[PDB]
Amino acid sequence: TRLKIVTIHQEPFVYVKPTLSDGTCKEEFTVNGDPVKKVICTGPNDTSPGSPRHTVPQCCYGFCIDLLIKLARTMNFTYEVHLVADGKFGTQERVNKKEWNGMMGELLSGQADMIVAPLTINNERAQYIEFSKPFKYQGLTILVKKGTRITGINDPRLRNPSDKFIYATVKQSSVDIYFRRQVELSTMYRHMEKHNYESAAEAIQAVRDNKLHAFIWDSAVLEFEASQKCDLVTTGELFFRSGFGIGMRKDSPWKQNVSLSILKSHENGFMEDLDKTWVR
Amino acid sequence: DNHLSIVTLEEAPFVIVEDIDPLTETCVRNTVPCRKFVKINNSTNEGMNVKKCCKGFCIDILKKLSRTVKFTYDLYLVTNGKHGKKVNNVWNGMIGEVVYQRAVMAVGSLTINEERSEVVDFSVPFVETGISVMVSRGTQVTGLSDKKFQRPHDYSPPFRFGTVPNGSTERNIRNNYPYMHQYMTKFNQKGVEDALVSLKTGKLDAFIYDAAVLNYKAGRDEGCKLVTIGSGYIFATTGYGIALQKGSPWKRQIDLALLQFVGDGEMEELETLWLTGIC
Numbered sequence: 001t002r003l004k005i006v007t008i009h010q011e012p013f014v015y016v017k018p019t020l021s022d023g024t025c026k027e028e029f030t031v032n033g034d035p036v037k038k039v040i041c042t043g044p045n046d047t048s049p050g051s052p053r054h055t056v057p058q059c060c061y062g063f064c065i066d067l068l069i070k071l072a073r074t075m076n077f078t079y080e081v082h083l084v085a086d087g088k089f090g091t092q093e094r095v096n097k098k099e100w101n102g103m104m105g106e107l108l109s110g111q112a113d114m115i116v117a118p119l120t121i122n123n124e125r126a127q128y129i130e131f132s133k134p135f136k137y138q139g140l141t142i143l144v145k146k147g148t149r150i151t152g153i154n155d156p157r158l159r160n161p162s163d164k165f166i167y168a169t170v171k172q173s174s175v176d177i178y179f180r181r182q183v184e185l186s187t188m189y190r191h192m193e194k195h196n197y198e199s200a201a202e203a204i205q206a207v208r209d210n211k212l213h214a215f216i217w218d219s220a221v222l223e224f225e226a227s228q229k230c231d232l233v234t235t236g237e238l239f240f241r242s243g244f245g246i247g248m249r250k251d252s253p254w255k256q257n258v259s260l261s262i263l264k265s266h267e268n269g270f271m272e273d274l275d276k277t278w279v280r
Numbered sequence: 281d282n283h284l285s286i287v288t289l290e291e292a293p294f295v296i297v298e299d300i301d302p303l304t305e306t307c308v309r310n311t312v313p314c315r316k317f318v319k320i321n322n323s324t325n326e327g328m329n330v331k332k333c334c335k336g337f338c339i340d341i342l343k344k345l346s347r348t349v350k351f352t353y354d355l356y357l358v359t360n361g362k363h364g365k366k367v368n369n370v371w372n373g374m375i376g377e378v379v380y381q382r383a384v385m386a387v388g389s390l391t392i393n394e395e396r397s398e399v400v401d402f403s404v405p406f407v408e409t410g411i412s413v414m415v416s417r418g419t420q421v422t423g424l425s426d427k428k429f430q431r432p433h434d435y436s437p438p439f440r441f442g443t444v445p446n447g448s449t450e451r452n453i454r455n456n457y458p459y460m461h462q463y464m465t466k467f468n469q470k471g472v473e474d475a476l477v478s479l480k481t482g483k484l485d486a487f488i489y490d491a492a493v494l495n496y497k498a499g500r501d502e503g504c505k506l507v508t509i510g511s512g513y514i515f516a517t518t519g520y521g522i523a524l525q526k527g528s529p530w531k532r533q534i535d536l537a538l539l540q541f542v543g544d545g546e547m548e549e550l551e552t553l554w555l556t557g558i559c
């Protein structure tokens with residue numbers, strides 16, 4: 001019937017703003033004169049770890065929200081959007097049992113029927129869920145405050161670390177999974193697990209406040225952040241390449257038509273339009 | 281039932297075809313056996329399977345899959361068309377071989393697209409592709425939406441550009457830019473090699489084709505004259521995928537193995553081995 005969509009705050013794929021006093025979303029327009037499509041997305045505000053979460057209606061828009069609207073119009077489904085309760089993308093952590101957290105956990109438990117977010121396709125998650133064909137191909141890069149001279153992934157301050165040069169990623173994300181899985185990056189993983197952040201926004205802020213020297217994250221996010229905050233720059237190109245897909249349960253009756261619609265959107269230039277509107 | 285009929289198609293450096301050894305009469309080194317049905321004459325349906333040897337990026341992918349997913353295979357080269365085209369509602373090429381169950385899977389430089397996905401399942405993409413435009417360095421073309429392409433007769437003389445017809449690139453152009461398409465057909469190129477010679481000798485202004493192959497060709501071009509427009513720009517981004525029959529029992533393990541190779545660096549190693557160039 002009516003799909004429960006889970007998403008996450010992640011500019012510029014998903015912007016999250018408070019509603020107006022009357023519970024509606026502020027009317028905005030692109031420089032292109034076009035109306036900004038916004039959806040009501042419920043979610044918690046107090047992001048404090050180990051604290052109660054009070055769910056309130058909020059405003060959601062961006063690359064992934066425009067993508068959701070297109071999917072819903074094409075496949076003729078209605079929906080309700082909520083933000084992931086723990087604010088995480090999702091990893092499998094050991095409890096004898098193992099459990100998925102973040103959007104992955106919500107999808108598997110039935111709290112969501114579909115993940116519509118910059119969700120990285122990897123082997124770990126594909127074992128438990130259905131990913132659509134990718135809606136974006138990107139990769140991993142490093143974000144630094146302008147003036148920080150790092151060469152990239154093979155820099156000695158990264159490969160042979162110390163508490164002098166702090167670097168991190170986002171907890172319970174695909175980047176966390178990547179560094180934990182690859183033994184060749186264990187030296188990096190051990191340094192990162194001592195300083196990883198709750199969300200990409202906190203990590204981007206920490207780099208600005210000179211509290212974090214390097215943030216290892218998605219290039220589609222970091223390059224957009226660099227282009228807007230001229231005090232931050234990415235260092236090098238991509239050291240790894242990954243794509244974002246729509247997440248569904250392996251039994252979903254929408255999985256074939258979701259992929260077909262994403263292919264249609266790439267082929268007719270709709271996806272490139274979204275990239276121009278929200279990214280470039 | 282793990283002995284699989286697998287279809288392929290030559291397209292360097294993804295799939296390269298070689299003659300079987302003169303002494304050994306077997307396939308050695310980094311090559312695998314691949315058969316090709318070759319007709320006796322054009323007045324008969326009679327032909328013979330010629331034993332050939334296959335290598336390349338997609339062949340190293342097949343070798344990895346065979347070993348991880350635990351299947352053996354009888355690899356053959358498609359003779360009824362190429363990658364895949366719907367002709368009078370009938371699929372030919374690698375797609376057709378899968379649709380009509382002559383092959384369990386198609387391994388090669390096979391573009392994932394919507395109409396192919398309605399008749400076959402595709403694995404996760406293992407190589408990024410889509411459509412790129414090859415030109416002589418410094419040619420001033422913005423992209424596929426450039427008016428030189430969209431409205432070619434608005435220029436005197438009109439810009440000369442073509443593709444290799446019957447593939448995913450021509451299909452996309454046909455579907456998206458009907459005027460550009462009907463104009464381009466007089467510039468149809470028999471293959472990549474003919475197109476590169478036409479560009480290099482001034483008989484063509486632009487060549488529109490598969491991004492993965494064009495990026496490879498640009499990186500190996502003698503004198504680094506032929507380039508792709510933009511920073512190696514890609515329209516209608518997609519990928520090469522393994523085509524499987526609808527509801528295939530093999531898809532699950534193939535997807536997981538491919539994603540394992542991506543995450544491990546095994547995919548990056550193949551790219552360094554087969555796809556890097558000097559330009």
Ligand SMILES: Cc1sc2nc(COc3ccc(F)cc3)cc(=O)n2c1[C@@H]1C[C@H]1CO
Nearest residue numbers: 121133134137243392405406407408518519
């Ligand atoms: C390796 C490669 S090459 C590759 N290319 C792309 C490029 O965009 C698309 C979009 C649609 C499509 F049908 C096919 C590709 C995405 C991507 O994720 N990848 C990947 C990772 C492994 C696959 C996960 O989906």
Ligand SMILES: N[C@@H](CCC(=O)O)C(=O)O
Nearest residue numbers: 363390391447448449490
């Ligand atoms: N890779 C393409 C062939 C080349 C092209 O049309 O660009 C296909 O699978 O059809």
